[PDB]
């Protein structure tokens, strides 16, 4: 019973340690996902501004192209479209990595949320069993009591036949203020 008890108690210890671990790891990735979201905001402002470049310079393309007399502005315009697309590619890869960070946070959070209640349940049923453990211990205690009373009685000056019949000082003879405690006139 104490074998199973100590296994469950070490189990409970490892559980509480693990809840600490998961909430710890989650709490540290919070600030990471926060900064990642801020760079995502920056990257979205970047997309918007690059699209404003795309829009005004495509307007200017339309202004110059009909019955051409072709200036060099349309090549720069198309180059700005390429820059906006490349920056869009970059922010898209980035929001993907951002999403990876966020979902790992969320699953860790979920594990952390269920772990506490799991610990509480193990605690509850641990109390249920440990009650019966304690009372059974008390039964074995009174059994010990019975055995030593019997044995102590039969051991000393004993009944009329010898068919069956110091160090360490058990017979209250530890000489630290015992005999000298008596009156002795």
């Amino acid at each position: 019973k104490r074998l199973n008890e100590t296994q469950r108690q070490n189990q409970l210890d490892e559980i509480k340690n693990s809840v600490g671990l998961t909430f710890k790891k989650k709490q540290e990735v919070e600030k990471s996902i926060n900064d990642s979201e801020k760079r995502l905001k920056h990257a979205m402002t970047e997309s918007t501004k690059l699209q404003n470049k795309i829009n005004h310079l495509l307007k200017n393309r339309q202004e110059l192209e009909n019955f051409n007399k072709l200036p060099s502005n349309t090549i720069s315009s198309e180059n700005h479209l390429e820059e906006g697309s490349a920056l869009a590619d970059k922010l898209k890869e980035y929001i993907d990595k951002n999403a990876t960070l966020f979902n790992k946070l969320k699953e860790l959070q979920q594990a952390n949320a269920e772990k506490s209640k799991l610990n509480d349940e193990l605690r509850s049923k641990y109390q249920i069993e440990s009650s019966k453990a304690a009372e059974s211990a008390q039964t074995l205690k009174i059994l010990q009591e019975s055995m030593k009373s019997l044995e102590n009685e039969v051991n000393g000056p004993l009944t009329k036949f010898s068919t069956e019949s110091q160090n360490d000082f058990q017979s209250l003879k530890a000489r630290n203020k015992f005999l000298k405690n008596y009156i002795t006139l």
Binding site: K24, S116, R123, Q127, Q170, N176, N181
Partner: protein, 613 residues
């Protein structure tokens, strides 16, 4: 989800210490589970649940009803009792977890007294040095040691009658003290940080003058570490100074320890530096003290490595191995520590015999509270000095008193020439009490009156300025008076200076050229008032006969040219064995306090007259 930072009262504390011994061959139980066949140096003792009779010997019935009722409470009710206990957490399984420490304690103690083991150790939790007989408090549910000790005394009236309970747990043993605060057969001591409300628990019961009550007087002790960061020095120091003489005086039949290694080196709730070798050497002294009777109970320790190493050292000392060597035998403990231990040994001399005639305390008896009445034979002496000078100056130069109203100081603290409000020039001598040179008798502490050499050096400038027809302001700040035990000269001086400057000196019609003289350490209060107010309008200069005292660091609170004006208008004569911009013209004087006063008076008075023109 605060499981990142769990509770300092933790289950691992038992298991960790149990592990450490099995790593050193002391325990030959490999699986770290409670068995009987431990090994050859020690002997395992079973732990049983304490009955209701044992646990109600000290505790009240309502307490047991509450702890028995909460054993099958609902979850939210447990939450309410957890948040309701003063840092005590309650949970579904709480009756047996609290009734097993007390039972284990009585087991270990009965094992020691019946001579079946040489001594015993009880790695145990929850603690019991914070549980009170009517309410739980401080991570503790039932006072284990009180239950155990009352069982030993009531059930063994033939071999044990006096017991010592020690608490080197850095938190004061609140619960274990009040149960035996009226008790005389037990001498309780607690080494702990006290820090007057700051440290845990921070209640009036933790003060160093809680020496028992009723017939329990002189049979209770609190050692109150003023500042954190004490180490092996102060521990061994207090052990030799207070513990061991009174220990060999009281002579117990049993010594019990409510130990805690929350003050061990490397701990966080304690923040102290007691190495486990200091633990082993104090354990050695306690082994020397009694005839061998010892039991240890675990209360503190919330750093697993500190408590584990400390426990391993103490366990080696317990098996029979002598103590190892300390980190530093040349450490020279803190002055405040020495003064606190002195004030302890004072009242202990007032009670016990072993601290007088070997510590020069047999002269006067401190059991008479020092009074001017006839109830006590003792009489204060600074009162006599001040009364003599008051009578003297009153019939002599008609020196009137200035009532320092709304402050707790005698009428003749400030002495003044009459009509001080019309003095065109006001000299303000912020002086200090005289000094003697004689040989104190080492056996009694009493002195001689036929060769007493006391000089009233602070009267020279008074008569000098009196001849100048300058208004003289004599102020007497004494040095702790030996009576109140909490008088602080510096802060009181600062208050008197603020008070007089804001209530009287700022209103005077003909006030001009206020000088300032400070003799000895009594000059630092001037630094406060100068730094806190703009006074240089009427102030011309400031003079200091520092003697051998350390310099006073001027930090100004109103301007920065105070330091310039101060350093320009300050002469601060110092010791020749002193050698030590904001200090204000440190002058390393030649002859040596009285020496530099009668020698540099001429320099002082002449610079006064030139600055005054």
């Amino acid at each position: 989800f605060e499981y990142i930072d769990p509770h300092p009262e933790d289950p691992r504390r038992i298991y960790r210490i149990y592990k450490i011994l099995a790593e050193n061959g002391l325990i030959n139980d490999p699986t770290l589970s409670g068995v009987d066949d431990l090994g050859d140096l020690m002997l395992k003792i079973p732990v049983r649940a304490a009955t209701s009779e044992e646990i109600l010997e000290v505790h009240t019935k309502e307490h047991l009803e509450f702890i028995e009722s909460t054993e099958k409470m609902s979850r939210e009710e447990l939450l309410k009792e957890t948040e309701k206990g003063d840092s005590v957490y309650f949970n579904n399984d709480s009756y047996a977890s609290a009734r097993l420490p007390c039972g284990g304690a009585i087991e270990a103690c009965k094992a020691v007294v019946e001579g079946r083991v040489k001594n015993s150790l009880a790695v145990v939790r929850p603690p019991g040095h914070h549980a009170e007989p009517q309410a739980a408090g401080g991570f503790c549910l039932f006072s284990n040691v009180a239950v155990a000790a009352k069982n030993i005394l009531k059930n063994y009236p033939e071999s044990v009658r006096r017991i010592m309970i020690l608490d080197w747990d850095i938190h004061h043993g609140n619960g274990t003290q009040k149960s035996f605060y009226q008790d005389d057969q037990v001498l309780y001591v607690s080494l702990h940080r006290f820090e007057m409300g700051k440290y845990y628990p921070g209640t009036i019961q933790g003060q160093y003058d809680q020496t028992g009550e009723g017939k329990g007087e002189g049979f209770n002790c609190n050692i109150t570490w003023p500042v954190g960061g004490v180490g092996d020095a102060e521990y061994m120091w207090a052990f030799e100074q207070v513990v061991m003489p009174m220990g060999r005086e009281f002579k117990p039949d049993l010594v019990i320890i409510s130990s805690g290694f929350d003050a061990a080196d490397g701990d966080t709730i304690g923040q102290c530096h007691v190495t486990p070798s200091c633990y082993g050497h104090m354990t050695h002294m306690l082994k020397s003290l009694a005839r061998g009777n010892l039991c240890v109970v675990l209360e503190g320790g919330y750093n697993l490595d500190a408590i584990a190493r400390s426990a391993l050292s103490v366990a080696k000392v317990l098996i029979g191995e002598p103590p190892d060597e300390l980190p530093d035998p040349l450490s020279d403990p803190k002055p405040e520590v020495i003064e606190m231990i002195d004030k302890v040994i004072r009242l202990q001399s007032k009670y016990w015999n072993c601290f007088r005639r070997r510590h020069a305390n047999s002269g006067c008896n401190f059991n008479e509270p020092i009074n001017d009445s006839i109830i006590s034979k003792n009489f204060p002496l600074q009162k006599a000095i001040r009364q003599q000078q008051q009578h003297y100056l009153s019939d002599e130069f008609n020196f009137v008193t200035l009532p320092l109203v709304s402050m707790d100081l005698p009428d003749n603290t400030v002495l003044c020439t009459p009509n001080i409000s019309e003095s065109n020039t006001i000299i303000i001598v912020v002086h200090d009490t005289s000094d003697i040179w004689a040989k104190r008798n080492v056996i009694s502490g009493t002195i001689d009156l036929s060769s007493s050499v006391i000089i009233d050096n602070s009267l020279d400038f008074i008569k000098w300025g009196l001849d100048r027809k300058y208004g003289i302001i004599d102020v007497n700040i004494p040095l702790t008076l030996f009576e109140p035990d909490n008088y602080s000269g510096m802060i009181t001086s600062q208050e008197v200076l603020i008070y007089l400057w804001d209530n009287y000196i700022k209103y005077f019609p003909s006030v001009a050229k206020i000088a300032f003289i400070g003799i000895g350490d009594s000059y630092s209060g001037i630094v406060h008032l100068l730094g806190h107010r703009d006074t240089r309008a009427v102030t011309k200069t400031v003079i200091n006969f520092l003697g051998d005292k350390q310099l006073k660091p001027l930090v100004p609170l109103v301007d920065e040219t105070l330091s310039e004006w101060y350093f320009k208008n300050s002469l601060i004569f110092s010791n020749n064995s002193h050698q030590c911009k904001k200090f204000g013209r440190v002058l390393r004087c030649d002859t040596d306090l009285n020496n530099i006063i009668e020698e540099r008076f001429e320099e002082a008075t002449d610079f006064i007259l030139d600055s005054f023109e």
